[PDB]
């Protein structure tokens, strides 16, 4: 019906404005991230997402500066950005982004409501893609800081996963303090719960671990309306943290904790959970932040071996998405892991 034409800067490459026309605008949702629309680009007919937030007079928008640097198949691409005007006499930043039709949150909930779990092949695909996205953003020192099922977008037919919502993302520089109130209930690393301000990108990995555990269990692994309640659930699984583990999380807490013995992880999940899935969780969800796998090491984990098989297909018969086209940037934290990550068939001439 109605067509909106704006002049917008491309997300990447040279700043040469373009005339972007779109129609059929619908709200996807709104909240602390602003408003996210869906729209159809008039030329191509392609669906896109437009995230609109209020632009501060005093500062450049952080999320924009992050989004302009990122180019990866498992992160929603910033296509265009422009400024416009709900609150009158005020400016809004608009981000025109890839649109993806589903979220891991919605998918997980469909299966949970049906009293089933997602097939493992999809857990593998989705989590592998999440870890790639993290290996990449971390290679810039950028921490997402809000990894949770709703921020993981999924295409139901191609099995492509894209990380979205960089409104909490930040470059973490060693020795700089960062706020500890980021990251969503259920997915917060223990050092965040303990109020640490010197945390690293490893908080993203904890969160990714909670996502994995949740897709395997059918419900969140560390629920609780308070930090206290989340710690209790964490302690029931990991066991009581030692003093050395406490100091690694947050020095100013070296309170007394309930003395609980570790619950053997095989006991945590349903009987036929693949053991390599369980081993992977156990290496993500560690108290000591530096003891956790890096994202790139998680990608190289045996849980993901099936994805490296030359004859692996999606259940609907299609090919898997691209999983091995690693760039030097992506590999830069440990280049020899290429020897596992790029399987032999992916290196045929």
């Amino acid at each position: 019906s109605k067509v909106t034409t704006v002049v917008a800067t491309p997300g990447q490459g040279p700043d040469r404005p373009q005339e972007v026309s779109y129609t059929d605008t619908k709200v996807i949702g709104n909240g602390s991230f602003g408003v996210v629309y869906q729209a159809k680009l008039c030329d191509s007919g392609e669906l896109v997402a437009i995230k609109k937030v209020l632009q501060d007079k005093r500062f450049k928008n952080r999320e924009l500066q992050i989004m302009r640097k990122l180019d990866h198949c498992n992160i929603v691409r910033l296509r265009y950005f422009f400024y416009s005007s709900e609150k009158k006499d005020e400016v809004y930043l608009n981000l025109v982004l890839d649109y993806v039709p589903e979220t891991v949150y919605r998918v997980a909930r469909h299966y949970s409501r049906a009293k089933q779990t997602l097939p493992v092949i999809y857990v593998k695909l989705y989590m592998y893609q999440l870890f790639r996205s993290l290996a990449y953003i971390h290679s810039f020192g950028i921490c997402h800081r809000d990894i949770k099922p709703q921020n993981l977008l999924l295409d139901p037919d191609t099995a492509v996963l894209k990380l979205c919502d960089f409104g909490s993302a930040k470059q973490l520089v060693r020795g700089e303090p960062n706020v500890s109130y980021i990251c969503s209930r259920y997915y917060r690393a223990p050092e965040l719960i303990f109020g640490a301000t010197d945390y690293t990108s490893s908080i993203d990995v904890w969160s990714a671990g909670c996502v994995l555990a949740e897709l395997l269990l059918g419900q969140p692994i560390f629920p609780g309306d308070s930090g206290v309640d989340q710690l209790v659930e964490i302690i029931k699984v990991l066991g009581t943290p030692t003093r050395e583990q406490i100091r690694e999380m947050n020095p100013n807490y070296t309170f007394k904790f309930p003395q609980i013995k570790a619950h053997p992880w095989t006991k945590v999940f349903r009987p036929r959970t693949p053991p390599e899935a369980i081993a992977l969780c156990s290496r993500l969800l560690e108290y000591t932040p530096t003891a956790r796998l890096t994202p790139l090491e998680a990608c190289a984990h045996s849980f993901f071996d099936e994805l490296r098989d030359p004859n692996v297909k999606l259940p609907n018969g299609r090919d898997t998405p691209a999983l091995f086209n690693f760039t030097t940037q992506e590999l830069s934290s440990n280049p020899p892991l290429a020897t596992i990550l790029i399987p032999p068939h992916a290196r045929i001439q």
């Binding site: 109605k2 909106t4 034409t5 704006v6 422009f82």
Partner: peptide, 8 residues
């Protein structure tokens, strides 16, 4: 970067 204009 921006500047808006609507049509139909």
């Amino acid at each position: 970067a921006g500047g808006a204009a609507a049509a139909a």
